[PDB]
Design a protein around this nucleic acid. Sequence first.
DNA 1: TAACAGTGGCCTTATTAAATGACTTCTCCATGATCTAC
Lengths: 109, 109, 109, 150, 289, 285, 288
Amino acid sequence: NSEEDKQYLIFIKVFQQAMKGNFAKIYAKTEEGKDPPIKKKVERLRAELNYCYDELSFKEYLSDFLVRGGLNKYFNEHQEEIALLIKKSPWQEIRIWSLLAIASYKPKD
Amino acid sequence: NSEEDKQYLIFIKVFQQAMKGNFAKIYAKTEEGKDPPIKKKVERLRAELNYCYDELSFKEYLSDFLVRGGLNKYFNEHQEEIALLIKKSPWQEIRIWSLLAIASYKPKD
Amino acid sequence: NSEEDKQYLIFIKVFQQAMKGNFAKIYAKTEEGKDPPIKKKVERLRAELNYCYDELSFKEYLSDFLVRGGLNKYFNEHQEEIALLIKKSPWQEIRIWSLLAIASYKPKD
Amino acid sequence: ADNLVKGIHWWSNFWEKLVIEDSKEYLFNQLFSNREGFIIMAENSEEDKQYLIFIKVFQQAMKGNFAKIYAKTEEGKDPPIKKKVERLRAELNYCYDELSFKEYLSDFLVRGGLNKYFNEHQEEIALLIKKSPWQEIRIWSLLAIASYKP
Amino acid sequence: PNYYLYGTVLTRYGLASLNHDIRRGNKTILQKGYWNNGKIHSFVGSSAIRWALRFYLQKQGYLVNRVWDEEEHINRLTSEDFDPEKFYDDDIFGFALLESSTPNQRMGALGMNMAVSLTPYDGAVKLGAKSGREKDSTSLHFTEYHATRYQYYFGIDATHLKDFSRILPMIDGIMNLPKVGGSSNIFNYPFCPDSLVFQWTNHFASYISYCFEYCDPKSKEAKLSQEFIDEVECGQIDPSKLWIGGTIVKDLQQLDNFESSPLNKAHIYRNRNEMIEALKTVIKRDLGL
Amino acid sequence: PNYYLYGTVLTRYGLASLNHDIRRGNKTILQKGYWNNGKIHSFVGSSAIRWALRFYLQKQGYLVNRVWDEEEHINRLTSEDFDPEKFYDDDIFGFALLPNQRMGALGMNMAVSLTPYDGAVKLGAKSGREKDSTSLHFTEYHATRYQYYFGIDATHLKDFSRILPMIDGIMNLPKVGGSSNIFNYPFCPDSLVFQWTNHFASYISYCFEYCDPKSKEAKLSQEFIDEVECGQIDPSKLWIGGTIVKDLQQLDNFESSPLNKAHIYRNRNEMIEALKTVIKRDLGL
Amino acid sequence: PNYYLYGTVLTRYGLASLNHDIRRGNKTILQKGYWNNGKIHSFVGSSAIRWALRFYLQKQGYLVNRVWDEEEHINRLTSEDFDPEKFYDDDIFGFALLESTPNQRMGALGMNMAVSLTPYDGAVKLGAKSGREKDSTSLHFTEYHATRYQYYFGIDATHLKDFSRILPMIDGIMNLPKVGGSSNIFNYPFCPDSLVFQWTNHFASYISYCFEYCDPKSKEAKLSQEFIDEVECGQIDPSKLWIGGTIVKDLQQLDNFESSPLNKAHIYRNRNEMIEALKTVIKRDLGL
DNA sequence: TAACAGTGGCCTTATTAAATGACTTCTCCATGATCTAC
């Protein structure tokens, strides 16, 4: 319930879809008998998330991550809501939401 | 409300229209039974957006991109204010908005 | 058990799994010596939790710790409930629950 | 005896009648003399064994907290149990509402180190701490201090 | 007639530790308790404000029975028999001689209620420690402070005064309150009013007690409560008997449809001195001074 | 006649770590709490400023009961019996035996940061190799200006002339207790609002406010300005000095405003001299 | 008398990666935070500058209790009991022996963190272990910052055990060794290029951070208008003000400079001449 | 088109957790023998 909670939940879904896309890209990148990453890529994503300062850097990185995720239906249905949510809101809160999405993305894969 | 986000939203809309027009132009460019990529087009657009180094770069880039966007109606009734928005505001904010528009573009086609 | 109690217990389990992951990471990092400390890690965690002074800092630390934990199967199973619980509840209550989870933690034999 | 006559818990008004209304630890000192009676009353309680489990948890936490400083302090510099227990009682008395008391109790439990009793009764003790009124938890912490065996 | 001066006065925002109670071990606890909607607020006792008013009367040069020695920190009575006819303090605050011709007690014209923090108490504490590496049992300590505004409610039975002219010094003292008993060395909290809602009426009923509210639970906003505004709108409170002064005047004037509200025709003054002067003129006319 | 000197001073902009709270674990916790807008603001205790004033009095003659050794880092009492008639320290700051206990002619409130405190943590390590439990630590700083409010009951002083050294010390404050080695923060004021009145009603407490989160422009106020305009706080009793004068004089219609006829000096020393002249005239010094 | 030497020194323009933060991942980040206008500036810790001053004192002879080994990167104490009378470092920087003559000393030097004059925008440098083989320690990133640095210090000269030890401290501030950082790839000289010193006998300074930028992405540096207003209004006695460095040219190019009270300050374009004059005044005042 | 996404080591060392004094003050009794007035 509540509009803010619904927007937050479906933004979590958006971020989880983006991480699925990025992890699939990493899977396609690696070849041969080398083990593709599962967990240390999540650690890399965490390190890149905490490497953030000011509003500009984090929003740039988040937008780049979302685009690199590729196709995503949750952002498809909700353009205005997530565009406003990302453009507005403190960047630290959005980082908290992104980390919460990271910690609960894995049931998909 | 607070027409700043109105300008943000119609900027996203005209950016999506322009990228749709450029993808249509690419579809015209390709030929024969080769499948015209769609995800690779988005990847190329993101890479070109990240290729810029402030002010001159990415400003003439995005103006040229919008020009090749073609007959964009929302551009036509929103020439002057979008030009003012582009002339003002930091360029990295414009890049963030463009990346968000790319991430939320698909349901058009 | 009420739904609030169920979510509270699930959050306790989520935090305990996150501590399991963090302590396993430390154990892998400091395999040298007679044995990596366990009491010192708990004291570090308690001090870092008590360092938080406001909602934003505490929630940032909690999200970072949860992500550092790893898979966290209990968060996999309960995306929306636990995410809403973290976003909504006052940070002092979440800190109380986290410290209760710390106290009720059993190191793996 | 008054609590038994009134038909309520035998610990119903222990705090405000034993700590608040104590002048110079006159009433407080009698708790350690009546420790055996406290242990007997807790063991032969007609119900509510969960709060006895909480007593065990709090006693383990108190053992850890006291042992930390007692290892920090060498022989001769080691203070008796009286000063530490008085400081603990004062800190418990500081708490004024549910949030502050539960925060202090949780921090004390964590500072107590590994707690086997809490681990064996995670769900029960966690629900008990979350749900029960903080005044009752404070009273039971007081009478767990009283029946603490060094 | 029987005239009463009811008033709710709001203090300025600042850090306050004026209401310590029985300390728990090391830390000094300030008096607190439950209030609006179940949160804990810090209370400043009304006896503190009464003592401050007594000290104001003594310092201004008025004849006061109980003289307070600043250098000795003791209280001395000029006359062992209380005489409300001659002494301002006995007339205003009353007395009660309880020991084994003149009356032994008086009800007192001034009736005051406890001062309540506008904002709920968060739990802030401050550590104090004596400088020096020579440390003993009294080296370090904790003192609780509260960053809020205090509001309190008072009522004066003007006809109950032995001398009717003594109400004016009480108003002056309320607007020029000396230090209200607290920790002035480290938490200097001025208790002078910055927002007033007074009522000078011959009816005994008052609907202005604790009429101030907060916009945010942790903020220095101090807006007028909706219940008080509604009671003014419905006509329960006569606007001609309402006296509003202080910083709340700006917020009232920025309200929508203020010019059409019955609150407009109340005595509203941004300057508290002007409001006090007008109210004192009305009081002098009504009491025939 | 009772005379009181209320004042709110604003410090210069810089990085401050003055009042570490409790040392939570590995971190030296800068003392902070909620303030104004519900944001966390760092605080400097009033006892620190009183200690700084005591040190100022000690360093320049001015017989004081408590003598800061500065070498053994201990306090020595010249006379075990406090004598406010002879010592500046006992006369000004009071005492308590636990007698006479004084009351204290100087009342001070805690200094409050003009800006919310975001995270401002500084890392600290000890050289290299042979690392131990003390090798790694963190310290919390704050890059803002601090603002505190004080009040003096001049008549309460045993010697009336002792108020002048107190003003001199306030304007020449020594190191206010803190990490001076790592975060050297001068506590001298760059903006002052002093009120030399004769009644116990001050509306200048914490007048300075700018919010504007992370900045240092430090505009005066809107509530204090409205208080001056409305009619109370007569400008004849108001003394404003410091860098705030430049912003004040640039305001529109400032010449027609009642704030114009207040004692406004850009130079702090000139305003202090004028105020001390007025004080000496009023107190019969 | 109680003489204090306050000062703000501005470094030279260059690529700087001096003070870093927690290791994080593969990218070493600078110590940065909000400084002015809500913009993020890079900081250099004052402990780094204190370490550099200690190293200078050690290198130029002198007696220092802490001796940096420079070979095994270890710190050795010549005497386990600190003696501020004998050792320069104990006298100047103080000490604190907590494990359990006084065991603690307040030190005569008080520094503040060096703040970059320019906001830190981007400036991450890619680093590779090279070769054809690849591993975890192959791809790394290092943050740098093309800016000047500016820090504020104060000296309580009377607090010194030996009053003459201030002179080596001024020499060290002038010829400062490398301030702790990645000097292998980002060699940043911390020697001053502009100085604003004040040799007064009262605690107020008003010269904390007197340098401000123009065109926020440029190397040009100018004295802040607040500092100039402070000098002109009457505060800050010009006779106690020592200004030296490349800022002297900009100061002299100002209009109405001759009529300005700033002209009466001790202004030397050559830093050595300014330091010599200041040390002459210091020796006269301290009776050296 | 590729391969990497940091390798280490620490996560505070002391110290003091209150010093005083007050712990209600008055009054309102019940009942029968006797005085006294009708």
